[PDB]
């Protein structure tokens, strides 16, 4: 039914994989090594010359957030109504903004930039704590009282930041509890513990 | 009006959503924030991610330019005819966003030193949208399907600002060129694009374009 085409890294597929696993969906992983990519043929066929590429039957998609939104739309993980859908997008766009900064650090400026990045991190995380505080005291999900694709993306963002800056959630009780709660969902817990996840590096350059 | 746009006195990340509203004949209010007012700090501190645009739809307050686009897309029926088309609309918009981020980085962080390399790389960055047009009714309608979507307005803005940056950049892309001409000629949009409301704002906030 579903196929994920990507490099052997967590990266921009981590959240959509968590979503699929937690939702009890089956999918095929099509692994593309850097050597295979460097040949050029698959890259030339990709819409924006990049991975992930995703297949849902005869539908082929590119763009990690398009894949998330598609799964959210088709699986009912996109809020209860239009108002919640907009809030879901607002969270996801915020997650994407911080992910872009994280990626820039990892791949272009790790040694020289890490200190300033970590110093700035609390101010980058506080909006998500605020979002939780304004939704049922943070006891459920990031938007409303059902899970959305933005929860999986935010969860991944938080997990990778815990590796980059251990203790970065200690000042944020709602985010800390939210990470624990979501990570304990049975199917997700099983996936996060699986070698499929654990034995992939977070990024492609050995930095985290 | 039920809609309010809160932004700096520039086109920037509100240009597409304004084009959308104008072309759809929807009324809205502009609340202008000067750099002076912004530097005071109170509005900024109240913004979810410390940034503008801020958007109000009745008592619904939104941040994030693409969130605003998607919201208006949903509520005004500019988000495809079915679930498959909606995904394709997202795929276009995400591509537009990726290039817009590169454009913004050039404008604000590296204009003089980076422009030549950027313009050299531009055809490769525009080609995917030409490809999308070529695979949809010979490029004679919209970017996805046979009705306009929020992605059309965002793509259109992206193309317009790149024509200012790199005049003639669409000479290599007949479908994109015709597409810009066609959408820009839509009566309400044409009127808006010619109006002081649009013309008298700079594209960006630093005087570069
Ligand atoms: N906006 C894209 C970015 C994807 C991207 O940056 N792809 C990287 C891997 S995560 C890639 O394919 N790099 C190989 C290349 O550019 O040649 C998304 O969200 O999917
Ligand atoms: N991801 C945001 C980016 C918004 C953004 O970069 N805002 C700029 C203006 S376009 C800003 O508010 N800068 C002022 C500041 O950061 O203090 C969006 O798409 O709305
Ligand atoms: O999000 N990324 O920028 C990103 C994700 C995953 C990877 S894994 C390896 C991909 C292949 C290398 C790039 C093409 O020679 C990245 N390598 O460089 N940037 C990467
Ligand atoms: O998309 N942008 O990076 C962007 C948009 C609009 C503007 S307009 C002026 C905003 C005020 C900047 C704050 C100065 O203390 C930008 N100025 O710097 N980056 C800007």
From Swiss-Prot, chain A:
* Gene Ontology molecular-function annotations: dinitrosyl-iron complex binding; fatty acid binding; glutathione peroxidase activity; glutathione transferase activity; JUN kinase binding; nitric oxide binding; protein serine/threonine kinase inhibitor activity; S-nitrosoglutathione binding
Cited Pfam families: GST_C_3, GST_N
Instruction: List all disulphide bridges recorded for this chain.
Output: none
Residue ranges constituting the GST C-terminal domain according to the UniProt record: 81-202
Q: Which domain of life is it from?
A: Eukaryota
Location relative to the cell:
Cytoplasm; Mitochondrion; Nucleus
Phosphotyrosine PTM positions read 2, 197
Q: How does it assemble?
A: Homodimer. Interacts with CDK5.
Q: What is this protein called?
A: Glutathione S-transferase P
Q: Identify the coding gene.
A: GSTP1
